[PDB]
Amino acid sequence: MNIFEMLRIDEGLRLKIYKNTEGYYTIGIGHLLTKSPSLNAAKSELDKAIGRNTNGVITKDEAEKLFNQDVDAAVRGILRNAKLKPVYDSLDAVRRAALINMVFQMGETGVAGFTNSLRMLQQKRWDEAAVNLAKSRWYNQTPNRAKRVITTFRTGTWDAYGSVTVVYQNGLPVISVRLPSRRERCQFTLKPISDSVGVFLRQLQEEDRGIDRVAIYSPDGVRVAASTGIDLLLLDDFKLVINDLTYHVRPPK
């Protein structure tokens, strides 16, 4: 796990302008366009960002370029800020990623305003920082996101950011999945010649009653039909969305 994978889990991929949970126009991998309720303002910002007339639609490659630019802008925002830089410098790699995640989401200025939480992080008062961060407007607005980021600060581990992997055993694909109701993964063995996407998704839901939504998408963000054979699915990478989280899956061969 690293900052790039972490943010992709949090943000997913959308190639057309959409409204985020706060009602604001967004595209790509969490690229906020504007807080104004004007779709034409969103498109104008997008066209500047991409360098062409997009009409509200971009390619995966354009989304990824924008994402890399936004991660770089977040890190630069930290390093140039007198309140964020010494906190960042003091933190281990995992907690640094949590701070970058915050800055990516809410901007340099918003995060620099968390004076007390920043002091607590600087002083390695992790439980206190976690308690204090949860009292914020940020947490109130996007609590599932903020819980994951707070867990990362509290523990200095990737406990909130799991992974989905595929390994062949006895000639069959075994898919290990982070489910929302348990910390340790569960493994699913599938029959490629007869099981479908929909079969797999139904097994996930049978396993964890805390799953409210599950779906599979192509690497370009296009929904994969339930009838699709697992053999066909495993010919390429895919995304497995479980509740609010988007996991990238890389099958071997």
Numbering used by the authors: 1 to 163, 1075 to 1164
Text of the article:
The mitochondrial calcium uniporter (MCU) is responsible for mitochondrial calcium uptake and homeostasis. MCU consists of two conserved transmembrane helices (TMs) connected by a 9‐aa linker with a four‐residue “DIME” motif flanked by an N‐terminal domain (NTD) and C‐terminal domain located within the mitochondrial matrix 11, 12, 13. MCU is associated with many regulatory proteins such as mitochondrial calcium uptake‐1 and mitochondrial calcium uptake‐2 (MICU1 and MICU2), an MCU paralog (MCUb), and essential MCU regulator (EMRE), forming the mitochondrial calcium uniporter complex (uniplex) 3, 4, 5, 6, 7. MCU NTD appears to be essential for the regulation of mitochondrial Ca2+ uptake through interaction with regulator(s) and/or modulation of post‐translational modifications.
To elucidate the structural basis for MCU functions, we designed a set of human MCU truncation experiments for crystallographic and biochemical studies. We determined the first structure, at a 1.80 Å resolution, of the highly conserved NTD of MCU, corresponding to residues 75–165, encoded by exons 3 and 4, fused with the bacteriophage T4 lysozyme at the N‐terminal end of the MCU NTD. The T4 lysozyme fusion was used to enhance solubility and to phase a new crystal structure using molecular replacement. The structure of MCU NTD consists of one α‐helix and six β‐strands that form a central core, two highly conserved loops (L2 and L4) and one leucine‐rich short α‐helix (α2). Hydrophobic residues in the α2‐helix (140GIDLLL145) stabilize the hydrophobic interior of MCU NTD through interactions among V108, I127 and F149. The L2 and L4 loops are stabilized by hydrogen bonds and hydrophobic interaction formed by highly conserved L90, S92, R93, E95, E118, D119, I122 and one water molecule (W1). S92 located in the L2 loop forms a hydrogen bond with D119 located in L4 loop, stabilizing the local structure in these loops. S92 is predicted as a potential CaMKII phosphorylation site 23, and we could expect that S92 phosphorylation induces conformational changes by breaking the hydrogen bonds in these loops and modulates MCU function 23, 24. The MCU NTD core domain contains six β‐strands and one α‐helix in the following order: β4‐β5‐β6‐α1‐β1‐β2‐β3, in which each of the three β‐strands forms two β‐sheets (A‐ and B‐sides). In the crystals of T4 lysozyme‐MCU NTD and MCU NTD‐E, MCU NTDs form helical oligomers around the 65 screw axis in a similar manner. We identified MCU NTD as a novel fold and named it “MCU domain‐like fold” superfamily based on the analysis of the Structural Classification of Proteins 2 (SCOP2) 27.
